[PDB]
Design a protein around this ligand. Structure first.
Ligand SMILES: Cc1noc(C)c1[C@@H]1C[C@@](C)(c2ccc(F)cc2F)N=C(N)S1
Length: 359
C-alpha cells in the first residue's frame, strides 16, 4: 500500500482531503475525508471559494437520478442534485467504480474560504445517508463492485498530512499492537467508552453519561466533543491538574485563546472480549491546538461524544467494516515530547460495559 502512503493533505482546522477523479474524461477534485457522514457530495457550481467543481456536462458516463437532496447541519447546509458517475482515487486502489454523487448547486457555511477541497467523502454507513438509506455510500459501492477488502485505515498527522489506506493496513504507520473496539451499530462509527481518566484519575461518572446519546469516531470534526455533564467534570479535573497557571473561564469554553502542566486524557474503550477493555491516551499536544496562540479543543456536545481529529491524530485508526470493529494503535507520526507519548494499552478488566451504551 506504498502508493497510498501520504495521500492526505490539508491545512490546520480545515480537515483532511484526498485526491479523487470523477467522470469520463476524469475530473480531478480534492475531497474531504469524513467518517462522520455517508454522502459523496461535490461542488458542481462556480462558488467563489472553490478552486474547481464537478462539471457534469463534460462527463459522458454521468447518469441523472432525477432527484434532489437538501442537507442541513447544525452549522451550515448544502443542497444538491443526485446522480451517478465513474469515480476513482489516483493514490488509492487501481479501480474505477460507479458511485452516487450529490452535485452541490447551493450551499451556506459549508465550503471554507481559503481551503483546498471542493467536496466531501462520507465514509460512514447508509443508515445516515441522505435523503435515505437506499442511497448507497461510496465505500459500499467500492466493495460491491471490486475485490477491495471491506476495510480502510486513517493516519492523520498534526500544513497537515496523512494516509488513507484503502482496503488494508500499513504496519509502518503504527507502533505496538492494534487494539479493537466493536462498532456498536452500523450508522455512524459508533463505539462505547467505558471509563475516562485525567492524569490516571478516574472521573467516577456513570459510564452511560460518556455515551449519551452516542460516541462516534469522526475525521470530519476537529474537536474532542464530550457530553456537557462529562465535559464539566473533565474540565474541572483538567483545571485542578493544571493549577500552576491560572486561565480565564472563556478559554475552557472555547470563547477565547491563550498565549508538563497540562494532564493526559485516557479513554477506555469496550474490548473484543467480555469484561475486557483497553485504553487510549492523548497528550496536551493533541487537545491544545495552535491557531503562540492555543485553542482548547475539547468542547461540550448535545449529540454525544465525538472522537474527532484531537483523538485521531494520536493514533493509527483502522475501520474494520468486515469485522464490525475499529482498531487503535499508537501513530508513528503523532506529535509528542521527550517526557510523554500517546499510548494504546491493555488488556484491562472492566465490568458492566454493556450498561455504558445508551438505548
Ligand atoms: C453534523 C454537523 N453538524 O454541524 C456541522 C458543522 C456538522 C459537520 C457535517 C460534516 C458533513 C462536515 C464536515 C466538515 C465540513 F467542512 C463540513 C461539513 F458539513 N461532517 C461532520 N463530520 S460534522
Amino acid at each position: 500500500f506504498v502508493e497510498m502512503v501520504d495521500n492526505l493533505r490539508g491545512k490546520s482546522g480545515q480537515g483532511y482531503y484526498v485526491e479523487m477523479t470523477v467522470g469520463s474524461p476524469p475530473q480531478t477534485l480534492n475531497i474531504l475525508v469524513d467518517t462522520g457522514s455517508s454522502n459523496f457530495a461535490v461542488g458542481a457550481a462556480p462558488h467563489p471559494f472553490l478552486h474547481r467543481y464537478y462539471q457534469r456536462q463534460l462527463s459522458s458516463t454521468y447518469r441523472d437520478l432525477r432527484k434532489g437532496v437538501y442537507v442541513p447541519y447544525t452549522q451550515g447546509k448544502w443542497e444538491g442534485e443526485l446522480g451517478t458517475d465513474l469515480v476513482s482515487i489516483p493514490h488509492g486502489p487501481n479501480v474505477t467504480v460507479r458511485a452516487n454523487i450529490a452535485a452541490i448547486t447551493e450551499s451556506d457555511k459549508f465550503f471554507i474560504n481559503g481551503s483546498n477541497w471542493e467536496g466531501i467523502l462520507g465514509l460512514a454507513y447508509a443508515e445516515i445517508a441522505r435523503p435515505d438509506d437506499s442511497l448507497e455510500p461510496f465505500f459500499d459501492s467500492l466493495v460491491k463492485q471490486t475485490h477491495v477488502p471491506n476495510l480502510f485505515s486513517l493516519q492523520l498527522c498534526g500544513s497537515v498530512g496523512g494516509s488513507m489506506i484503502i482496503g488494508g493496513i500499513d504496519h509502518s504507520l503504527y507502533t505496538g499492537s492494534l487494539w479493537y473496539t466493536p462498532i456498536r451499530r452500523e450508522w455512524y462509527y459508533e463505539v462505547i467508552i467505558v471509563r475516562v481518566e485525567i492524569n490516571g484519575q478516574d472521573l467516577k461518572m456513570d459510564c452511560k453519561e460518556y455515551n449519551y446519546d452516542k460516541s462516534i469516531v469522526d475525521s470530519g470534526t476537529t474537536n474532542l466533543r464530550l457530553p456537557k455533564k462529562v465535559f464539566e467534570a473533565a474540565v474541572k479535573s483538567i483545571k485542578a491538574a493544571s493549577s500552576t497557571e491560572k486561565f480565564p473561564d472563556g478559554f475552557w469554553l472555547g470563547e477565547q485563546l491563550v498565549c508538563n502542566i497540562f494532564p493526559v486524557i485516557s479513554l477506555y474503550l469496550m474490548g473484543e472480549v467480555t469484561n475486557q477493555s483497553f485504553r487510549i491516551t492523548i497528550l496536551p499536544q493533541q487537545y491544545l491546538r495552535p491557531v503562540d496562540c492555543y485553542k482548547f479543543a475539547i468542547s461540550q456536545s448535545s449529540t454525544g461524544t465525538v472522537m474527532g481529529a484531537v483523538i485521531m491524530e494520536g493514533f493509527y485508526v483502522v475501520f474494520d467494516r468486515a469485522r464490525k470493529r475499529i482498531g487503535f494503535a499508537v501513530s508513528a507520526c503523532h506529535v509528542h515530547d521527550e517526557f510523554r507519548t500517546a499510548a494504546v494499552e491493555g488488556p484491562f478488566v472492566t465490568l458492566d460495559m454493556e450498561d455504558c451504551g445508551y438505548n
